[PDB]
């Protein structure tokens, strides 16, 4: 239901070719992980789903709808993105999470904070969800701030959700609580996970390996780790030692 066909893309006229001839189908409800060297074009692939850019060759389509012709507002509702680092407005946690669904009850915010593994640390705060984050009020850790952002993203309920190195700075136990629920957070919707840390995407239905603007490998963790001279096995071979 997300389709890339013969996609070539560069950022500007004199830019080098970033994506060269990608062909790819991601079906609805599928957890897909994307790995590869720094600069291989992982994010750029992801940016083409958001119509931040028009590709010089080929089409990007969502359930048949070409993103060249699609309505620009309809587009922004389809995709939710959690980057490595996220803003957080200078106000309460409750108000920060509720950006995704204005008019939300406390109960639903609880639910979504539980889902992102944020509820335990929020509750321990003096003022709970009313606590006030941002560049003035009581600061938080990276990981904690990152967990609020993910809760926020979970409430939005996009038909396509992108994690762009979102748990890369999170501890293994905190990442797991989030991912475990992704088996329930992908229910009816696509989950795209760009990861430097291979084990982050260990339970993906499919893992895509990028190298110099193209998909050179694919399969499950096992299917990819069966090939000895594959790039995936080389990456995994490192720092598992
Ligand atoms: N706004 C931009 N303008 C021009 N070139 C860009 C822009 N953003 C990215 N690039 C180039 O595109 C290539 C891939 O970018 P991208 O961020 O998709 O890689 P990545 O695989 O996500 O890298 P990393 O793992 O380092 O985040 C890089 O060579 C980079 O220089």
From Swiss-Prot:
| Function as written in the Swiss-Prot or TrEMBL entry | Part of the ABC transporter complex HlyBD involved in hemolysin export. Transmembrane domains (TMD) form a pore in the inner membrane and the ATP-binding domain (NBD) is responsible for energy generation.
- Entry note about domains: In HlyB the peptidase C39 domain, the ATP-binding domain (NBD) and the transmembrane domain (TMD) are fused.
Superkingdom of origin:
Bacteria
* Subunit description: Homodimer.
Additional comments on file?
A: The complex HlyBD-TolC (OMF) forms a single transport channel across the two membranes, allowing direct export of alpha-hemolysin. This channel is involved in type 1 secretion system.
Residues binding ATP, per UniProt:
36-43
Q: What protein is this chain from? A: Alpha-hemolysin translocation ATP-binding protein HlyB
Q: Which protein family is named in the record?
A: Belongs to the ABC transporter superfamily. Protein-1 exporter (TC 3.A.1.109) family.
Organism field: Escherichia coli
Subcellular localization is given as: Cell inner membrane
ABC transporter domain residues: 2-237
């Amino acid at each position: 239901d997300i389709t890339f066909r013969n996609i070539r893309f560069r950022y500007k006229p004199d830019s080098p070719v970033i994506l060269d001839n990608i062909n790819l189908s991601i079906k609805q409800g599928e957890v897909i992980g994307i790995v590869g060297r720094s600069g291989s074009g992982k994010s750029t692939l992801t940016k083409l789903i958001q119509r931040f850019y028009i590709p010089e060759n080929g089409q990007v389509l969502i359930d048949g709808h070409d993103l060249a012709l699609a309505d620009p507002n309809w587009l922004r509702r389809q995709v939710g993105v959690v980057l490595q680092d996220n803003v957080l407005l200078n106000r309460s946690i409750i108000d920060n999470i509720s950006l995704a669904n204005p008019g939300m009850s406390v109960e639903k915010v609880i639910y979504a904070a539980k889902l992102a593994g944020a509820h335990d640390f929020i509750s321990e705060l003096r003022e709970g969800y009313n606590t006030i984050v941002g560049e003035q009020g009581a600061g938080l850790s990276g990981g904690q701030r990152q967990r609020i952002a993910i809760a926020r993203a979970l409430v939005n309920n996009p038909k396509i959700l992108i994690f762009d190195e979102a748990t890369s700075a999170l501890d293994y136990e905190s990442e797991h609580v989030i991912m475990r629920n992704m088996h329930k957070i992908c229910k009816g919707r696509t989950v795209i996970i760009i990861a430097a840390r291979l084990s982050t995407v260990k339970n993906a239905d499919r893992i895509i390996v990028m190298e110099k603007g193209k998909i050179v490998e694919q399969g499950k963790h096992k299917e990819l780790l069966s090939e000895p001279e594959s790039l995936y096995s080389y990456l995994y071979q490192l720092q598992s030692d």
